[PDB]
Amino acid sequence: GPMNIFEMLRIDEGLRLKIYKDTEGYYTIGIGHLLTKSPSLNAAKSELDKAIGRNTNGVITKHEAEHLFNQDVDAAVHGILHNAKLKPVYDSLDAVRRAALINMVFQMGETGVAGFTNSLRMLQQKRWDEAAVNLAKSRWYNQTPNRAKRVITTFRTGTWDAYK
């Protein structure tokens, strides 16, 4: 198998077939698919049953998680292209550097990554080292350091060495 965004996020997020609380405490399933920010487990069960189209009882198959994963990766890509701040940054970046941005939008969302501003401007201006240093000072690095370290390596080197 070769290297791509789908294989990148698979190593980062991992697979979980049952409803679990994430790093922020929100109910999630599959390959890091956020169900609800609501504190109720029942609220998450309704969102899951909606996304799958059957009574899941908080349990899904690997294939069912693959569908959500492919849908989330695609949603992240379209989200970047529809965001006025994210799209000019995206188009400038190369194939491998685009994947690193998708990873962040998969993890934090459209609005969350668009709030970086300075780091986004640095990547658009091709300043790879300056952006890498600035990303470590962010709240994203303090919360998930293992995750961010691999993404920062991808944005600075322009290669997928952090996964090889």
Would you name the residues annotated as active-site residues? 13, 22
Q: Could you tell which of Cl ion, Cu ion, none binds residue 119, using a CB distance below 5 to 8 A set by kind?
A: Cl ion
Contact 27, 48 (CB under 8 A): no
- Sketch the per residue contact string, 48 through 87, with Cu ion: x for CB under 5 A, - otherwise: --------------------------x-------------
Is 119 a binding residue for Cl ion by CB under 5 A? The answer is yes
Between 34 and 77, CB nearer to Cl ion: 34
Is 36 a binding residue for Cl ion by CB under 5 A? The answer is no
106 annotated as a binding-site residue: yes
Q: Coil, strand or helix: which one is 73?
A: helix
Contact 160, 154 (CB under 8 A): yes
Q: Coil, strand or helix: which one is 105?
A: helix
Choose among 53, 56, 37: nearest CA to 45.
Answer: 56
- Residue 5's Cβ-side half-sphere holds a number of Cα atoms within 13 Å equal to 22
- For residue 36, the cross-strand partners are 27
Site for Cu ion in 98-157 (CB under 5 A): none
Q: Show binding-site residues.
A: 34, 106, 119, 134
Q: Show binding-site residues for substrate.
A: 34, 106, 119, 134
Residues of this chain that interact with Cl ion (CB under 5 A) are: 33-34, 72, 116, 118-119
